[PDB]
């Protein structure tokens, strides 16, 4: 019914909006006129939301995060308001390739990989949930940087995302709010003042967030640094504009690492000033003793801390309840740890943030005041109850005063928060009882745990239409709002017509995406052979060089024996590498090497490809995981966190080869561990061998296939010209790698002949996938929710 | 009928547009609104306009500048479309007051006046005579200084209207273009090439021009620089350098600022448009027609570059012989000068150039060669000639007077009045127009009767309208048939009773805004315009505190009250202007605030001069300032402005002056003070300024209360600066303009006493107004020097 009214409305916007007809109309044109049709019915529904948010007044949660990796739009829109089919008939009957459009759209990569995904899928599961939750970030002008390969290295280029302007973002010009930094302290009688300060103002920006079929859009706001009006030489001040709004100029492109550059250090007070300046005022312009208002402020909010970075947001609460709306210390510390809860999500010592006293003290000199206080009042609780442990002061400390003093935010968001959580079992289980211990051992109940999830309205009706329509075709629509429902799925482990249906299915995937393959690299691609990928940022921990040195010991095999039975199979790794990662970088040089010299190799031909998928990101997450059989998911035992890529490739299909690391085992508990290819160390065996001491060489002697691999990248086999261009791997990796890369090399090749084994066994491969799917039912980001909600948030879904 | 649609069509938008209900929506959303449904009218004419153009394909005219004075659109736009008395009814009826909505707009000031203002009412002429003109410029994201007066010292402010979006404007992605800058030569036996340049993308954004009544809608197209697609951090913010191409407007008027950043704004502007044109050109041997299809009109030589450019692209690129580009080169383009002083021509060292765009200097040599074999063929003795014809001025620092590029790249050169076209012809390029007669011309000035009539005074041209029709709007020389009521008692009556219903409107924004209080029967002389030593504020000023020590000595005198109203920004770097503008502030303070004076004389510095503020105060005047020294102003303007709305004009017989005074008779306006030659013979005999200070009584109080700290008592000599550039370095004769200036303006206000005989002239000045349409202009343009014809 909507299909002729879709068809004039796109007509209306060709030519209201983009001034244009169907002659001089470009594929953008049709794109964007297609966008405004589809965003035109979100419009009611945002505005009720929200409206309903004013008059019932339910706790409202507020996801605050520095990144937000959303992907497209306008695909994920169609399908959670039950538009998709009725708009491909539109475009298709107006002579339009609606898959053509979609491409046209720039993802919005406002982050590096997991972190900000979490907040994506998270945001998703909120709408859904029918939550009042808000999500804030910064708009970066520039997210992830767009990825290429030149010369076999990886190159930077700006991602501009904005160039063409993004019809999903409504700049909220009447909520902008100034932002101070600099500045100097000086108390008087009429309570703290910070003065002499620099402003930078923040401009909102609103993007809606559909929940799935269920009436609600929720709010996804982003602010973006301009430089304020008041108050030769002329030119160069307004160009020197540039300075202030440089704050949300470009997101910092470390996965787990901390780089302690001021810029980032100004982003982080940035967005935290801003949010919890809105949050103030939505609640002051609620329904929600000369001070009977802000009492009621922790049953109201819940701002939830996505890691440390908006750590600032503790004290920046305190800065405003105690300087600005004059409580006691007492009173305001009280509401703050009411207010916030903390998201941890690595042990790295690299990944976490201590931001030198130095820098903080001439940026926000009154936070660093603040910070002490909240620690001279916390050592003086910690002296109370444990008056002789002086080694405990220290440990426990916000300021690690070691050489450069500096500010553990980790520990700042420890007792600035009532919770405290990791993103899986394990991962908690560490947090809590390792890292810190000291924290856990006085506040018991404080620590939590919140196994991680994936929307399965992104990550399966999304991008695996097939599939989805698959299993409704089986158990009905259900699973989609509980995925839970998917154990149903056990009930046709028997039968040979729904396998045959499952493996079709991963069949059209697989096709659809090997012209994608072929469209744009060079090589062949052997439809029949196994996918085997491991796709996620590029780590010496999450060690895509395992991975590197199993391909590498393939085709070793075949020119060796080149008639034995090789089960073939499509290598496909991806993931993008921070421009100052030189070991990551030098990895990917390798990966492509390998490549090279396998794809040309005549003797090896449809028996092994190996392919460095560029510029991985979510919409191409979306492309390539529906389509894998075999995923990669290797890192060193108590290296992830958690992940969510593996959690992707399990709902979708594919096998899962990796160690009992992250959420792995939480899906090898689900599965059944004898369904997944699990190998390896596992958390203690790694310790056991720190505690011995790691000797590298000792298997690089005792292991034959290895010493040939190894020798074979340091001679030049794989890089003629620069005879020792990967020296500097080499030497990682035999006097310097903490992530145990040749320790797992056997366990790891040996599993690897498993799984070739068992696919050459449909049956029992289709058999194995059907378990996992099935069992995919906990890692729904709704059911993650669900638990923060109940358990750290305390609001109620829907 | 349209009200009904045009508010289903505003809630439409107020939604979906801007997400809002009448609950929660701004000012500012109403605006918005109401822009969007406006703005929903020209798609289809707009879509059809240029259709047309690709099928009928007329001659195209293309007005190359650096500046694009437009001021708000909303308005403009409802008026000609005939749409303003509509969407008012729907405002209305919504609820909400149109006036309120309007002022939400932020003036494209892409302009710093006049220059820039003229390339605004031509585009609105332009699509009014269905014309197939377009015009290229810069979308600078920062437009003309907002201004603001601190302890009386003007203050800039960044004008940042880009900051809650442009409805009025498309980008069109799909056209970007690079443009190059820096490399270096390399000829080789392919051609010439240009490399190991940086590029700067150059992205252009639309925005319609609609005629006024007559079904079409032009294009102007603004173009802005982006770069092409913790060290990386560094590189990424790096790309604010790139685009730092088109971040601000250099606020300088009537003069030249030799800087690089300019430099390469006005080869971006011309690399992308060139290329853009090229492009339409070839999407409709080929070359041979391109002078017959296109006319690149230049305003001024900042857009010089495009003469080399355009050779550039037909040697480097399409591969012609010199000959045949040179060729279609001139037939292509036309130069309009607008200044005769030196310090406002552009001469740019070949050094900079040279470093910046190697290709180009290499060109305008070759120009250059060719241009001096030439005149030695004809005159190989007179070897002064040759340097005083050449590009490049050999002296001390080799500049390149681009002003002789344009020259010779151009089949036509013009002036902006006859007096100025004259200076230009016979005196200042006389060994050009003695070779090329024919190509010097004059075009007068004009201003849109759209804008500075029917938009800024519904009152005054409902009042015309409802005497003489609406004929008067599309041929603005209809208006003498305002003369068949010089008599009539009752038409002077409501011609007053406008400009007194302009003047309390405009009262109360005074009111508002500064702390005196206004005479409502007061007379208003205002000077309204850039502040220069030229256009000599100065001597007003020096007029105001004549007046004031008259009332005070004569406590009881009568005086003729005025409401004394000078406004204008100073480019930030001009010192004197600054100094100007804190002399007339501190005087206006002392004048204001004295009981003795009261009522009788108030001065007020506007602040913040622009377009929507011109609409205003303009309408809302009696006596006009227009007082340059004779032989400065190569037309102006403004004075145009305030003769159509009613306003008397006080001036030399400077610029345009003198065709105002030729057509209303001078005797209708208060023409005084030295004229061309009296300012040659003074400057022969030599300017000696203490003598008019010892010979004139009255001035020297002015003078020695200035200098003695009577307007600064806080920093006695605050002013030493004014006074010995007044004394030892004045190069426009302030001092010798003094007592016939005040002469004059006592004659000004005798006749103020005597409304019946004030309004005669002002009905004869308005009926004479004709000419000075932007509409006469464009035809005289059109036929001959574009070669097109209107509709
Ligand atoms: O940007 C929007 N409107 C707009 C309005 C006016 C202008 C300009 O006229 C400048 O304000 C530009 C964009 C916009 C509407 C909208 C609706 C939904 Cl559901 C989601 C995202 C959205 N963005
Ligand atoms: O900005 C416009 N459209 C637009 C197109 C797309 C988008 C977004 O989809 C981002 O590209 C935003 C605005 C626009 C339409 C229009 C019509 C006339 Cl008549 C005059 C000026 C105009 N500007
Ligand atoms: C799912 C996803 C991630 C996170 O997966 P990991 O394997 O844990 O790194 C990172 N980047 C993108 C683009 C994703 O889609
Ligand atoms: C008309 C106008 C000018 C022109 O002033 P002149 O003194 O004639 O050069 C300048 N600025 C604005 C805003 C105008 O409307
Ligand atoms: O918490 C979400 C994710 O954040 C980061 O990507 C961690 O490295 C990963 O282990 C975790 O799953
Ligand atoms: O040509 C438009 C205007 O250009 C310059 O501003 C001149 O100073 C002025 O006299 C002229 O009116």
Known sequence: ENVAELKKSFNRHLHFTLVKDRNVATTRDYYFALAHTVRDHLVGRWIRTQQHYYDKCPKRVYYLSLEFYMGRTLQNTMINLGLQNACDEAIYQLGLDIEE???????????????????????????????????????????????????????????????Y?????????????????????????????????????????????????????????????????????????????????????????????????????????????????????????????????????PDQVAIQLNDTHPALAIPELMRIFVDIEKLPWSKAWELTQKTFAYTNHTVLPEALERWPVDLVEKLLPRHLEIIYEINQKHLDRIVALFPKDVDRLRRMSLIEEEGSKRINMAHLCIVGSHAVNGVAKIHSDIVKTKVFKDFSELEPDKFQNKTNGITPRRWLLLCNPGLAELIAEKIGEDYVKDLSQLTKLHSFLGDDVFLRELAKVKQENKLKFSQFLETEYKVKINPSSMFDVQVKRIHEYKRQLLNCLHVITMYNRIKKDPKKLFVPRTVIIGGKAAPGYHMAKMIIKLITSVADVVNNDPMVGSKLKVIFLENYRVSLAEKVIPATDLSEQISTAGTEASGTGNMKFMLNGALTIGTMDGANVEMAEEAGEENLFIFGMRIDDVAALDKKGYEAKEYYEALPELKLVIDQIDNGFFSPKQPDLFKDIINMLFYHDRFKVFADYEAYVKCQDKVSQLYMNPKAWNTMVLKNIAASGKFSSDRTIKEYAQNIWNVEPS
């Open 101 to 163: 459009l979609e491409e046209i759209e720039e993802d919005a990569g406002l982050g590096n990989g997991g972190l900000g995904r979490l907040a994506a899928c998270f945001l998703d599961s909120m709408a859904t949930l029918g939550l009042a939750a808000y999500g804030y970030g910064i708009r970066y002008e520039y997210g992830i940087f767009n990825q290429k390969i030149r010369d076999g290295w990886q190159v930077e280029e700006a991602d501009d995302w904005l160039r």
């Open 165 to 297: 302007g993004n019809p999903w973002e409504k700049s909220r010009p009447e909520f902008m709010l100034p932002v101070h930094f600099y500045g100097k302290v000086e108390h008087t009688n009429t309570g703290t003042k910070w003065i002499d300060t620099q402003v930078v103002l923040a401009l909102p920006y609103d993007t809606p967030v559909p929940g799935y079929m269920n009436n609600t859009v929720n709010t996804m706001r982003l602010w973006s640094a301009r430089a304020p009006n008041d108050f030769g030489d002329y030119i160069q001040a307004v160009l020197d504009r540039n300075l202030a709004e440089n704050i949300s100029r470009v997101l910092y492109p470390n996965d787990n690492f901390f780089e302690g550059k001021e810029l980032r250090l100004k982003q982080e007070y940035f967005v935290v000033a801003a949010t919890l300046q809105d949050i103030i005022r939505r609640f002051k312009a609620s329904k929600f003793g000369a001070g009977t208002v802000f009492d009621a402020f």
